[PDB]
Amino acid sequence: FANFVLPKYDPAEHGDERWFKIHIGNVGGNTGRQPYYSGMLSDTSETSM
Amino acid sequence: DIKITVMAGSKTHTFTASDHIASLPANSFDAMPYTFKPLEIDASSLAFT
């Protein structure tokens, strides 16, 4: 189990869209990326999941 | 400033996060999850009534 805390949304850093896509990489026999999660950021506080 | 005090008969122990920490979280205003090491306490002074 891994707990991730993501910072507050930033138009300068994150950009035009607040939502983010978490992807997993080197797994099984696939080196490429696979979208493992989709999250909705918060513009008022950090997001922990 | 964070500690767990176990009392059992005359045996009283105080295990803090400075010497018995398993995962030290971040330093922020949001939720802070604190988990300690597996605590092995010898409790042989219990008065079994």
Distance CA B26, CA B10 (A): 36
Resolution (A): 4.3
Set of chain A residues whose Cβ sits within 8 Å of the Cβ of B32: none
Distance CA A11, CA A26 (A): 30
Question: What end-to-end distance do the CA atoms of chain A give, in Å?
Answer: 10
Asked if residue A19 lies in contact with residue A41, where contact means CB atoms within 8 angstroms, the answer is yes
Asked if residue A8 lies in contact with residue A22, where contact means CB atoms within 8 angstroms, the answer is no
Distance CA B37, CA B30 (A): 23
CB–CB of A5 and B33 under 8 A? Answer: no
The alpha helices in A1-49, defined as continuous H runs, are none
CB–CB of B30 and A3 under 8 A? Answer: no
Place of tokens 């964070």: B2
Residue among A5, A8, A44, A47 with most chain B CBs within 10 A, to mutate:
A5
Experimental method: cryo-EM
In chain B, which residue's Cα lies nearest the Cα of A44? Answer: B30
Distance CA A45, CA A47 (A): 7
Among residues B45, B49, B48, the alpha carbon closest in space to that of B11 is found at B45
CB–CB of A48 and B31 under 8 A? Answer: yes
